[PDB]
């Protein structure tokens, strides 16, 4: 028998590593606001979760929305059994409809507590270690042709075989970016051109027609699924859908249409690790390749990502990412590690992460039974 | 770290409690043939699982198929970590395609071992106790109409408030059998008419038109999904689909069509608890009412059923049944308990059931290292 | 009048002529396990049939399943009239649902008995000799450039005009294999790239795109039909479906969608010569090109293949294969022949084959009336 | 080895046993014009076939069309092997397109020859005796309440349990016919209202709505399939489709829509026994109830019908009919028999009928090798 005796909410800043990070149609990242949920039990077990967006207009999700949900839910979540992850899921969904991003860090703490109570890592409770090290990608580059060929060779020797070309702000120069990058990677390598919902549908098509002879992954060219499918009418490139993959309902529709070659799964865009796990399991059973990820964050959100990716079948997992190494600051102590281009989950009980209390500060809100 | 060190296959007879069990187009269960899989490990943890068909021609499943599969798979499973349920699932699926019924006892034994290794019941590893005592039904087999009135008094006495009327042997007398049964039930009580694929489409339509002024659940009127949809065109009765619900592919088709009011989920028909869980979770998310069951069997089969039912949201769980109480003989020691017409899962680690070695006899096959 | 008086089951090892057979996503048939069914009658007419899998995970079928089926069904088949193939078909399908592969050798033995009782070869009862010598293909060859050009020349000289490029284990080098083999063929000639369910959907699309300028038959690129259709969205190459063609239900779907250019018909994957003939005749009437085959096997299986091929209209028959020539051991005495790259059925009554009792050994099971 | 040496065409009058035969929207058949084909071989095996329309405007078929087909095709069939029924089918279809009704007597004669060459009845060559005595219907009656009771009592005692009401000339009084006939038959019995393509779609709907509380079979209410489907939008009655079922293509459409509860199969409307068998087997595999019959005719047409019925699975065979007993004159010697309201095929080799050369008179056309 277990009871939740306390809920606290922490908030901190996570500056970008380079200082400047561009995405989509001219968006700006410099500081990302983190929300850390800490849940305490009468047996002295404590779990932590995290939601951090990559921009406040990236998905149907913003940083102040975690506080507002917690204020309604946390008094109603006190005295309840936290290792019963699905029971907590249904209770949080009975308290407020939608708002999945805000429930996400609570759910990760519940999975963390389940892991500690069972003496097992989170990947074990998600089915086992189906992937020994998730493959990763490098977000490189932007620079000169001679510098690009050098930096790709530094990524190649480090073990990276997959590269993201960040596009979506100017379809015409994006054509030039794609055309110049692809002869610079060698035979076995993957390039994904992510527009981050950035192109208008006509301009997306012009780019597809101009790069029709080329082998790359066309990733989220437009905002809606319907615009993306309209681009797909012309585009033969393996299409990766990301921001529009908001849950099981959209996954069902992507499957019904065979509407993408890769589905990108962001844990908090799917509304928590419980819902993210169910969407991937559905997509895997329908033999759809997936990426296992979250929007942004430090060690705590990255620990959930690592366990999500390790529990994905190796045959169908395209990549994952090391979200904690995109920041100069931290949210938790521990989390996942990176070894030779691959992302590895912890094998210790729970999420393998505890809150970095000194980085976060005193809690901004607090509910004790 | 854990390894499978021994696999034993057991076979035993399970005689029916009321002599004959009339189901379908003229079939009968007097003695059902149980198949029990016992898995040993190097840490001394033992898991067990059971498949028992309710008739050898009922679904795409028969008792001798378990032996056949076990001969092919069991040497390949020795030395493997049975706690990693999804890894075993994919291993078994890599070794043979389909034949899910035969993989089902092995899958139940893994969830048993993982349960013991975590110190938790199977319902906790399936999400939590989302239902505290599954509302039960009792099947009233194909007998005379004067002696099913007394059987519905006998089953109501045992605390059941839901009754499955076995029909499907003759549409004409089945109309009479339905019309006589319905005014013999009190407020709050439900009836389902299960034809067990027995009716021809034209006859099923005739039955549906003749009983249009009545409230009962029309269950699997014909063999195929398509046939049942042809009936549904005319039949306004809530339709339960059962035998044709073979997996997630069918679940997807049923949801796309909104093709039933109830989907029955038999563990062995879905290919084990791992796959059953996922079809359950998919249907609940699409707000399809479910029944959590298996085909037939003793305490071991019933243990997996009870944990499956307990982790199903009570809002969407129509019923389950106590399979172990249909037989005069046992497969297991322990298992689930029933109290006032509700089925309760065990709260002890693992499945909460061990093999009844004295009832089972010497194993028919034994693989060790 | 005729009655089955004895059913015997034989099992034997069929080793591959060239050691190992590399198919699909990295699989190997070093030794195949043959299942031979032998049926005796009260007029002393004997029938025989064979199911042998090309890998135990190739389709929904394994070698131990025949044994399992026979144990349940054979006591019920004694005393029954084997000439009446549809009655026997019916009976089997009443005893078990699905498991068509296991029913397949029984069905072939019945067609064998009907042929002997009517004094006609099996092709005659299948409709007549609609093809005089079925075209064949060679697997060809994974070698040098000169050694390939020379080995294709000797197969060409021997009468072969069609070649199978075995692919499916590595999309990237599979591109190279297709690109290197096509300029080595001359122009009346046909290449089929069989991935054997090997590719992930995205990689199959990459391959199809990189070889869009090339004329070849793209064969079963992915596991499921839906995945193959997703590849077909992009690939203009004639598509051959094979392992997903499991029955009439699927053929209807394929025809409705116009979803392939060639349908590959494996006798045992269709559930026997009775269901294979009906699926064949359905596709032919809808003007779909067909291949007439089976999974694997000796002379007994090949005899069923040859008569199946001989009764396929020449205009729509793509090829067949000499399965008996892939092994170093025999299941049968007699069987079909190969002349100038073409497969010829026997013209003597029945299947044209008797069991090689010296090779088969002691029967593993024997039921007598 | 066998060769067609001689083809003869005969023509004869078959007067209706009860004067005039009222069907559809104002049609009457008093004398039907039979076309009998007689095929001789070099081994002295003779085969016969028959097509007789029930009215020249009944289906896409008339009596004079057999002559026309024969004059074009018969010189091209001399020297051919008649036992190879699919080779003959495909030769005919190569010589002319469509006109299957005219090919139908030739097809029957080839099945006759094959049965003689193999020493087996045609039902054996169509799979076996899957129905022992096909159930029959009586087209009765059409008169007063006192006279209908006496007529249904003699039919009941004679074994009949199924009754056709000939309607379709006046929807308004067809409502009254249905309404007055249905309560004059007991629990087990059945009744089909055959409008024989006769109602206009709005009138068919008015009839459907007026009788929406009644248990009968709505048979071919309108001419086209689409008109029938429009009626079916409103009509919950089991729908029987007949004249519009012209072949496999239409049977595929019917299956896809699940657009009927019974399909009526007329051998000559399907283009002969070969296509008729393939269409039936397809519908039975899709679990559609069928009627096995033909348009009209004497002992030769009825022999083919009885063999067609006998090889239809009894679970799915609704009824058949004794065509020879509707006429006062003969086309053949032998044919099927009737006992206790069931139609029985012959067990002797071939069709079980020879041409009644004395009734047929001089051959109208004669082709010799
Ligand atoms: Mg992205
Ligand atoms: Mg049921
Ligand atoms: Mg193939
Ligand atoms: Mg009719």
Bound molecules: magnesium ion
Q: What's the multimeric state? A: part of a larger assembly
For the largest sheet of chain A, list the strands in their spatial order: 7-8-9-10-11-12
Distance between the termini of chain A: 17 Å
Task: Give me the strand/helix succession of chain A.
Answer: EEEEEHHHHEHEHEHEHEHEHEHEEEEHE
| Class from helix and strand fractions of chain A | alpha/beta
- Number of helical stretches of at least 4 residues of chain A: 12
Biggest interface pair, counts: A-B, 32 and 32 residues
Task: State the CATH topology of the largest domain in chain A.
Answer: TIM Barrel
PDB class: structural genomics, unknown function
Keywords: enolase, racemase, structural genomics, PSI, protein structure initiative, nysgrc, new york structural genomics research consortium, New York SGX Research Center for Structural Genomics, nysgxrc, unknown function
Entry title: Crystal structure of mandelate racemase/muconate lactonizing enzyme from Roseovarius nubinhibens ISM
Chains A, B, C, D: Mandelate racemase/muconate lactonizing enzyme, putative
């Amino acid at each position: 028998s277990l009871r939740i005796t306390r809920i606290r909410l922490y908030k901190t800043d996570l500056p970008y590593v380079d200082g400047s990070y561009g995405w989509g149609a001219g968006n700006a990242i410099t500081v990302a606001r983190a929300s850390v949920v800490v849940i305490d039990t009468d047996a002295g077990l404590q779990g932590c979760g995290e939601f951090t967006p990559c921009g406040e207009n990236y998905m149907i999700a913003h940083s102040e929305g975690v506080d507002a949900f917690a204020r309604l839910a946390a008094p109603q979540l006190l005295g309840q059994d936290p290792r019963q992850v699905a029971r907590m899921e249904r209770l949080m969904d009975h308290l407020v409809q939608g708002h999945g991003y805000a429930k996400a860090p609570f759910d990760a703490a519940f999975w963390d507590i389940l892991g500690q109570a069972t003496g097992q890592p989170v990947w074990m409770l998600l089915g086992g270690k189906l992937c020994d090290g998730a493959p990763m990608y490098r977000v490189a580059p932007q620079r000169s042709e001679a510098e690009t060929r050098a930096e790709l060779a530094r990524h190649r020797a480090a073990g990276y075989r997959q590269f993201q070309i960040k596009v979506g702000a100017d379809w015409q120069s994006d054509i030039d970016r794609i055309r110049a990058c692809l002869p610079l990677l060698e035979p076995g390598e993957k390039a994904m051109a992510d527009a981050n919902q950035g192109w208008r549908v006509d301009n997306a098509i012009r780019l597809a027609r101009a790069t029709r002879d080329l082998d790359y992954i066309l990733e989220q060219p437009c905002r809606s699924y319907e615009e993306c499918q309209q681009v797909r009418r012309v585009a033969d490139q393996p299409m990766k859908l990301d921001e529009c993959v908001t849950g099981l309902h959209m996954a069902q529709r992507i499957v019904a249409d065979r509407g993408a070659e890769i589905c990108c799964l962001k844990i908090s865009n799917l509304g928590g690790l419980s819902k993210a796990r169910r969407t991937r399991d559905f997509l895997i059973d329908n033999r759809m390749p997936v990426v296992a990820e979250d929007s942004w964050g430090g060690e705590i959100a990255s620990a959930a990502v690592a366990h999500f990716a390790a529990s994905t079948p190796e045959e169908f997992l395209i990549n994952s990412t090391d979200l904690m190494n995109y920041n100069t600051r931290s949210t938790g102590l521990g989390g996942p590690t990176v070894h030779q281009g691959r992302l590895y989950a912890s094998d210790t009980p729970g999420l393998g992460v505890t809150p970095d209390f000194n980085s976060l500060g005193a809690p901004v809100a607090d509910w004790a039974l």
